[PDB]
Amino acid sequence: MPVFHTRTIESILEPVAQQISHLVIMHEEGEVDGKAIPDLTAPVAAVQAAVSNLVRVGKETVQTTEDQILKRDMPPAFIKVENACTKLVQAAQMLQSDPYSVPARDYLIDGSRGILSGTSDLLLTFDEAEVRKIIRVCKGILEYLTVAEVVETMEDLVTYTKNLGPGMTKMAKMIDERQQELTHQEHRVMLVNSMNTVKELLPVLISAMKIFVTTKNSKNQGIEEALKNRNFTVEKMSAEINEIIRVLQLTSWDEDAWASKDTEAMKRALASIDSKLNQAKGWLRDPSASPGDAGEQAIRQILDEAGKVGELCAGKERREILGTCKMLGQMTDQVADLRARGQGSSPVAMQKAQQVSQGLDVLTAKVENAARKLEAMTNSKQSIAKKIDAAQNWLADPNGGPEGEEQIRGALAEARKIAELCDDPKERDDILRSLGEISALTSKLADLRRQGKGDSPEARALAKQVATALQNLQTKTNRAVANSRPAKAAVHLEGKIEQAQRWIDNPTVDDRGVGQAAIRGLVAEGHRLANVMMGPYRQDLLAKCDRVDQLTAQLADLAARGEGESPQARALASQLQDSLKDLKARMQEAMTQEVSDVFSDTTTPIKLLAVAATAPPDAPNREEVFDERAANFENHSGKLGATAEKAAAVGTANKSTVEGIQASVKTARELTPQVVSAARILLRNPGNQAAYEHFETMKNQWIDNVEKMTGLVDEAIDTKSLLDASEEAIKKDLDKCKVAMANIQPQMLVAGATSIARRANRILLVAKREVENSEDPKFREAVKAASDELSKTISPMVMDAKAVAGNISDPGLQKSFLDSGYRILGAVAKVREAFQPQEPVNQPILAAAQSLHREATKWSSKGNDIIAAAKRMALLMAEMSRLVRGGSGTKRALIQCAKDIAKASDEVTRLAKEVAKQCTDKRIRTNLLQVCERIPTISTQLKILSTVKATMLGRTNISDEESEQATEMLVHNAQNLMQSVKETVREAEAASIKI
């Protein structure tokens, strides 16, 4: 298992990769030819010289690191490479004896993998104790997080500040070290963007400590919610401290991410459906007296929240919940058109309305029960990872009496069978070979009893046999996820467009719902878009939602019956994509109007919260006046918490923002009660200094959060979108301000006048973000300068707003006031002038290969700039995908092309950095570097794994599942390669057009 956990490992193995390729390629012609072998006497000690230094340090670490933890696995570890150290020099001198020795041919090549194992084995084994000190430091962080309740006095928090102070400084600097020591930039990003938060919420915690002891003096009603302020934020920081455990424990390329990242929607669902329940039913209990205010949108999101449950749960189950909601929605829409004729009152057609209310009850039952049958595999997957490496513990010591220990590895291996009893029901075929071999290791577990009558020298014998067996048990459960989680979606919509696109040819053979759930994903968001939009467009967009949604089963049948190549199945798939093209441009325009509305009052009710929280005299019902402002605050943010996800739905950008904006969402989600709890306790003792400034922490902690939201969500959308949306919003509100002056409305006028001002400052805010992101002042000077006109004309707004506030029939003021609006409209029109451009036993690597085989058809049909490297990668990626389980005699090109897979990868990285320095935008350059970092990270690994596979090839006494594990490394990481390439081939032009 040649790992790539640390920079120091690749700096040593890639030398050794050159070294063992210098000799295994010669071992070929010992086998395939038996010719006069060239005298490689000189590499023998020289490759030993690349090892003996590590051996002696490996002995020196035994000679120096005195804690027995590394002394239990590492001294057995270099025994193997010292067993390699025995044979390769004997392999030398026997080849000195005989150029043709069959007892040397086997003899040298057994060591060559024992090198590449054992070299790689030792370098991770160095990294073992390297990071376990950091775990205790992380535990020491968590120690203070256990002390984060211990503080009961103001003096204690100062000492606690004096506790965390050296702790946090000791913390982050070691984190910077492993940042340097790592090479997965996508996982490097995981580490730092955890670490900045736990530093950032740290004074917020300390401020919460400040406010707690003040409330410990008087407001011991608040120490309830201040603990709720505290312990949540304590649990918030400790969550990433829990998360950086597996970041530290991330030994190799991750598989467990999406199996754990997609657990979010279930906890999202269960706390959401209960709230959408009552507002749906009593809405639909009086149907024709319910026009669709929010229960229709509740009924909509009930379909939508259950719609992502079917994205999670799959198999035969995914046809069922998709069926019953499509059943329910047409049942409701039948009743919704019983409202248009209106003849159904509350008892008129209740026979239908109960079968709808029970029909939704089927929808809510199957989602909450498949939920526990979704998360149960993840309960076992974390469980099964514990005992597979616990194998090294008891196999190390030959114990005569580990009978209490015998029940531990005995019954937990039976709990692996319980996990196999959890693994069983999803499939049958691959199940029974695992459901048979689960008892096969119990026979080896039965072998623990006989030598458990005190026998050491055979406890080492089956140890090699259970060495293959233990990892084989995990590797089958490693396969248990490609048939228990369906083919997941891109968070990119255009990725899901591609995910939709690839499924159209061969539906059944792929991982499940690669387009089918992607079509289920793409259509379920337009439903989330259409409901908030207005009535006559609502069903109109639902018409555009459901005219393509009727193609769900219509494209789930032409491979389920017959083949799709019949033209009544081809054109029915071909007329699909025409209407499906009509989705995104509406769905973009759908989201476009939303964000310009919901982010209008971005800080505004918060200031209304603030002036509510500023001066209450504790009069009656004025706290209730705050309560609706408090109610406004969620109702503002809950729309904001809704929209930014829908902004993330149609973002059309980097992953990094759209993975980062969702992180910004849940900050704004979870700080939203943290605001109110801070806002309430300021209302409990108004006028207190420490209450005010801690509010001024937390409130301003929310602002720059929602500013970081604001400044990213408009970056999450395009500037063509928002300006037109701003322009149409401001002309409408000015007309709303105009018809407020048609009648006598002064106060609604000046509120709308200030509504311009809060939106005008937003416009100038966007004009800053272009300039700091544009590299050069090509015209971004005018982006300042037109916003400089805004900063001029913002002041005649409010001044005239007061000046027109005297009379609705103020003579000539409204002439100036519409002109004051007309000053804005030409200015925002100048912002449009800115952003214009015019101044063969494995074939899963086949799926990796046939990926970029189909991305050959993009960006043009005429020329090539970088593509030719990617396609000569792809055909060699196609060639190896044969050859990995291919013929048993051409393992030389396994490495000889992996040389190019090193080479042609990082050639593109050279091509990456040059257009990065050619481009005129730092964000596309920052997005280019985060994706092109992994290209050399991956590149040399495929050299390394090809060597291991050459030792797997022609071996004829390998436990072939380990070769299958070696195949799986060539499976996943070439898939991880091929996916990562087209990201750059996207940004080959997705960035380059910005010039």
XYZ file of N, CA and C in Angstrom, residues 241-376:
408
model
N -12.067 20.349 15.551
C -11.013 19.616 16.240
C -11.263 18.123 16.122
N -12.532 17.727 16.153
C -12.871 16.365 15.777
C -12.606 16.121 14.303
N -12.793 17.144 13.473
C -12.657 16.958 12.036
C -11.190 16.905 11.635
N -10.326 17.613 12.361
C -8.922 17.594 11.970
C -8.231 16.342 12.464
N -8.915 15.533 13.274
C -8.409 14.207 13.604
C -8.246 13.384 12.337
N -9.345 13.216 11.594
C -9.292 12.427 10.371
C -8.516 13.142 9.278
N -8.413 14.467 9.361
C -7.508 15.188 8.479
C -6.071 14.803 8.784
N -5.725 14.743 10.071
C -4.426 14.209 10.461
C -4.338 12.723 10.158
N -5.423 11.999 10.381
C -5.382 10.577 10.097
C -5.584 10.260 8.629
N -5.698 11.263 7.757
C -5.892 11.007 6.333
C -4.589 10.450 5.791
N -4.529 9.128 5.767
C -3.307 8.462 5.373
C -3.105 8.577 3.872
N -4.145 8.276 3.102
C -4.058 8.232 1.651
C -5.235 8.996 1.070
N -5.458 8.807 -0.228
C -6.527 9.494 -0.945
C -7.894 9.075 -0.422
N -8.743 10.062 -0.152
C -9.938 9.820 0.643
C -11.000 9.105 -0.174
N -11.756 8.251 0.507
C -12.985 7.694 -0.019
C -14.160 7.976 0.896
N -13.891 8.296 2.155
C -14.918 8.372 3.177
C -15.620 9.721 3.199
N -15.172 10.671 2.377
C -15.672 12.041 2.382
C -17.145 12.130 2.010
N -17.479 11.748 0.774
C -18.847 11.884 0.284
C -19.797 10.953 1.020
N -19.275 9.839 1.536
C -20.072 8.988 2.405
C -20.378 9.676 3.723
N -19.572 10.663 4.114
C -19.875 11.426 5.315
C -20.327 12.847 5.020
N -19.905 13.431 3.892
C -20.360 14.776 3.549
C -21.839 14.803 3.215
N -22.381 13.688 2.744
C -23.776 13.660 2.346
C -24.702 13.253 3.480
N -24.199 13.194 4.709
C -25.060 12.967 5.856
C -25.817 14.219 6.270
N -25.513 15.364 5.657
C -26.054 16.641 6.103
C -27.547 16.757 5.836
N -28.022 16.165 4.743
C -29.378 16.448 4.304
C -30.405 15.732 5.163
N -30.002 14.650 5.825
C -30.928 13.922 6.680
C -31.228 14.702 7.947
N -30.188 15.226 8.600
C -30.412 16.129 9.722
C -31.052 17.428 9.262
N -30.814 17.817 8.007
C -31.555 18.923 7.416
C -33.027 18.578 7.268
N -33.324 17.354 6.831
C -34.704 16.987 6.531
C -35.545 16.896 7.796
N -35.049 16.164 8.803
C -35.855 15.792 9.967
C -36.284 16.997 10.791
N -35.470 18.043 10.819
C -35.854 19.266 11.496
C -36.598 20.231 10.585
N -36.857 19.858 9.332
C -37.533 20.739 8.386
C -38.946 20.283 8.066
N -39.146 18.972 7.960
C -40.427 18.434 7.517
C -41.498 18.690 8.562
N -41.104 18.659 9.836
C -42.011 18.935 10.945
C -42.567 20.351 10.885
N -41.750 21.293 10.423
C -42.199 22.672 10.323
C -43.034 22.889 9.068
N -42.701 22.194 7.977
C -43.506 22.288 6.766
C -44.754 21.414 6.824
N -44.963 20.685 7.923
C -46.084 19.753 8.012
C -47.395 20.492 8.259
N -47.470 21.228 9.374
C -48.722 21.850 9.800
C -49.129 22.971 8.857
N -48.151 23.736 8.366
C -48.453 24.805 7.423
C -48.847 24.279 6.054
N -48.654 22.988 5.790
C -49.172 22.404 4.564
C -50.611 21.949 4.751
N -50.877 21.231 5.846
C -52.139 20.512 6.010
C -53.308 21.461 6.220
N -53.210 22.324 7.234
C -54.278 23.275 7.499
C -54.447 24.285 6.385
N -53.366 24.550 5.649
C -53.486 25.224 4.366
C -54.371 24.424 3.426
N -54.033 23.157 3.215
C -54.841 22.370 2.304
C -56.103 21.823 2.948
N -56.296 22.005 4.254
C -57.572 21.607 4.835
C -58.676 22.577 4.428
N -58.326 23.835 4.172
C -59.290 24.765 3.606
C -58.797 25.159 2.221
N -59.028 24.306 1.211
C -58.295 24.404 -0.060
C -58.586 25.636 -0.893
N -59.855 25.824 -1.261
C -60.207 26.925 -2.148
C -60.082 28.267 -1.442
N -60.113 28.267 -0.110
C -59.724 29.430 0.674
C -58.236 29.448 0.990
N -57.420 28.772 0.190
C -55.967 28.813 0.325
C -55.370 29.040 -1.056
N -54.917 30.257 -1.371
C -54.445 30.542 -2.731
C -53.038 30.059 -3.018
N -52.272 29.674 -2.006
C -50.893 29.318 -2.246
C -49.902 30.280 -1.635
N -50.227 30.796 -0.448
C -49.398 31.785 0.229
C -48.051 31.218 0.677
N -48.058 30.201 1.531
C -46.839 29.493 1.888
C -47.028 27.997 2.039
N -48.265 27.512 2.152
C -48.486 26.081 2.236
C -48.214 25.374 0.930
N -48.525 26.028 -0.192
C -48.132 25.521 -1.503
C -46.621 25.413 -1.611
N -45.909 26.447 -1.160
C -44.457 26.370 -1.143
C -43.982 25.378 -0.092
N -44.754 25.203 0.985
C -44.462 24.139 1.939
C -44.644 22.782 1.291
N -45.778 22.592 0.607
C -46.032 21.384 -0.183
C -44.949 21.187 -1.239
N -44.465 22.290 -1.808
C -43.372 22.222 -2.766
C -42.099 21.689 -2.119
N -41.701 22.281 -0.990
C -40.420 21.920 -0.394
C -40.480 20.561 0.297
N -41.683 20.108 0.676
C -41.868 18.731 1.135
C -41.445 17.752 0.050
N -41.878 18.007 -1.187
C -41.370 17.259 -2.332
C -39.876 17.466 -2.507
N -39.397 18.662 -2.204
C -38.008 18.970 -2.488
C -37.081 18.381 -1.436
N -37.454 18.474 -0.155
C -36.624 17.904 0.904
C -36.616 16.383 0.841
N -37.757 15.784 0.511
C -37.770 14.347 0.280
C -37.072 14.004 -1.025
N -36.983 14.972 -1.941
C -36.308 14.728 -3.204
C -34.823 14.477 -3.040
N -34.210 15.105 -2.041
C -32.798 14.842 -1.806
C -32.605 13.579 -0.987
N -33.655 13.122 -0.307
C -33.573 11.832 0.368
C -33.414 10.729 -0.662
N -34.132 10.851 -1.777
C -33.982 9.894 -2.856
C -32.661 10.041 -3.580
N -32.048 11.222 -3.491
C -30.666 11.349 -3.925
C -29.750 10.519 -3.048
N -30.066 10.425 -1.759
C -29.240 9.642 -0.852
C -29.552 8.158 -0.962
N -30.773 7.771 -0.615
C -31.156 6.369 -0.551
C -31.486 5.865 -1.948
N -31.040 4.653 -2.259
C -31.056 4.181 -3.638
C -31.453 2.712 -3.672
N -31.194 2.080 -4.807
C -31.566 0.693 -5.021
C -32.961 0.592 -5.615
N -33.779 -0.284 -5.043
C -35.194 -0.289 -5.377
C -35.921 0.809 -4.616
N -35.306 1.292 -3.534
C -35.916 2.315 -2.697
C -36.058 3.641 -3.435
N -35.119 3.948 -4.337
C -35.125 5.249 -5.002
C -36.238 5.358 -6.032
N -36.745 4.229 -6.518
C -37.907 4.293 -7.390
C -39.161 4.556 -6.578
N -39.137 4.175 -5.301
C -40.348 4.204 -4.492
C -40.654 5.615 -4.011
N -39.667 6.284 -3.412
C -39.914 7.616 -2.870
C -40.062 8.642 -3.993
N -39.319 8.475 -5.094
C -39.547 9.297 -6.282
C -40.947 9.075 -6.836
N -41.442 7.842 -6.743
C -42.779 7.557 -7.229
C -43.856 8.213 -6.393
N -43.747 8.097 -5.067
C -44.841 8.532 -4.207
C -44.938 10.048 -4.124
N -43.840 10.763 -4.361
C -43.920 12.217 -4.363
C -44.447 12.719 -5.698
N -44.028 12.074 -6.790
C -44.615 12.358 -8.094
C -46.085 11.965 -8.118
N -46.442 10.916 -7.373
C -47.846 10.596 -7.135
C -48.525 11.694 -6.331
N -47.899 12.103 -5.222
C -48.484 13.100 -4.330
C -48.643 14.440 -5.019
N -47.620 14.858 -5.766
C -47.651 16.164 -6.398
C -48.748 16.288 -7.435
N -49.000 15.211 -8.177
C -50.108 15.224 -9.122
C -51.442 15.100 -8.402
N -51.454 14.464 -7.228
C -52.662 14.473 -6.411
C -52.949 15.872 -5.889
N -51.915 16.558 -5.397
C -52.092 17.923 -4.914
C -52.426 18.878 -6.046
N -51.792 18.697 -7.207
C -52.047 19.604 -8.319
C -53.443 19.384 -8.888
N -53.975 18.168 -8.741
C -55.386 17.928 -9.019
C -56.257 18.730 -8.065
N -55.890 18.754 -6.786
C -56.629 19.554 -5.819
C -56.308 21.030 -6.004
N -55.101 21.341 -6.486
C -54.758 22.735 -6.750
C -55.576 23.291 -7.905
N -55.939 22.441 -8.860
C -56.853 22.864 -9.906
C -58.309 22.628 -9.528
N -58.558 21.987 -8.383
C -59.876 22.046 -7.757
C -60.083 23.378 -7.052
N -58.994 24.108 -6.807
C -59.094 25.448 -6.242
C -59.397 26.482 -7.316
N -58.964 26.222 -8.551
C -59.192 27.177 -9.632
C -60.661 27.202 -10.028
N -61.268 26.023 -10.163
C -62.719 25.959 -10.259
C -63.357 26.277 -8.913
N -62.666 25.965 -7.815
C -63.026 26.463 -6.503
C -64.209 25.801 -5.842
N -64.780 24.761 -6.450
C -66.029 24.205 -5.947
C -65.801 23.340 -4.719
N -64.560 22.928 -4.485
C -64.237 22.160 -3.307
C -63.976 23.038 -2.105
N -64.928 23.063 -1.180
C -64.730 23.686 0.119
C -64.029 22.693 1.039
N -64.039 22.977 2.339
C -63.291 22.138 3.270
C -63.891 20.742 3.492
N -65.210 20.517 3.529
C -65.698 19.125 3.519
C -66.152 18.561 2.173
N -65.944 19.254 1.048
C -66.544 18.819 -0.217
C -65.811 17.608 -0.782
N -64.492 17.710 -0.924
C -63.715 16.618 -1.497
C -62.656 16.126 -0.518
N -63.047 15.919 0.744
C -62.101 15.500 1.777
C -61.642 14.055 1.587
N -62.392 13.258 0.817
C -61.964 11.908 0.457
C -60.658 11.941 -0.330
N -60.520 12.922 -1.219
C -59.244 13.129 -1.890
C -58.218 13.730 -0.939
N -58.650 14.669 -0.092
C -57.718 15.413 0.751
C -57.155 14.544 1.866
N -57.883 13.499 2.254
C -57.299 12.567 3.205
C -56.313 11.632 2.516
N -56.613 11.203 1.285
C -55.670 10.362 0.552
C -54.447 11.151 0.104
N -54.564 12.476 0.012
C -53.374 13.300 -0.143
C -52.610 13.375 1.172
N -53.324 13.602 2.280
C -52.667 13.731 3.578
C -52.114 12.395 4.054
N -52.714 11.291 3.613
C -52.067 10.002 3.814
C -51.035 9.731 2.728
N -51.208 10.321 1.541
C -50.233 10.128 0.476
C -48.934 10.860 0.743
N -49.016 12.000 1.417
C -47.810 12.631 1.924
C -47.263 11.854 3.111
N -48.145 11.176 3.852
C -47.705 10.404 5.008
C -46.891 9.192 4.584
N -47.194 8.635 3.412
C -46.329 7.612 2.834
C -44.995 8.226 2.437
N -45.031 9.452 1.911
C -43.806 10.138 1.526
C -42.942 10.447 2.739
N -43.562 10.804 3.863
C -42.751 11.136 5.029
C -42.339 9.889 5.804
N -43.023 8.763 5.596
C -42.658 7.560 6.333
C -41.443 6.898 5.710
N -41.406 6.851 4.381
C -40.344 6.130 3.696
C -39.031 6.892 3.765
N -39.096 8.206 3.968
C -37.854 8.960 4.031
C -37.226 8.853 5.415
N -38.040 8.806 6.473
C -37.489 8.792 7.822
C -37.061 7.400 8.235
N -37.491 6.387 7.497
C -37.143 5.014 7.809
C -35.983 4.531 6.956
N -35.896 4.998 5.709
C -34.688 4.768 4.931
C -33.538 5.639 5.409
N -33.824 6.653 6.231
C -32.780 7.488 6.814
C -31.901 6.688 7.761
N -32.521 5.957 8.690
C -31.752 5.079 9.567
C -31.139 3.935 8.780
N -31.776 3.547 7.676
C -31.180 2.577 6.772
C -30.249 3.221 5.755
N -30.021 4.528 5.853
C -28.947 5.200 5.138
C -27.707 5.372 5.996
N -27.887 5.870 7.217
C -26.772 6.178 8.096
C -26.175 4.939 8.741
N -26.832 3.784 8.608
C -26.379 2.591 9.312
C -25.082 2.052 8.728
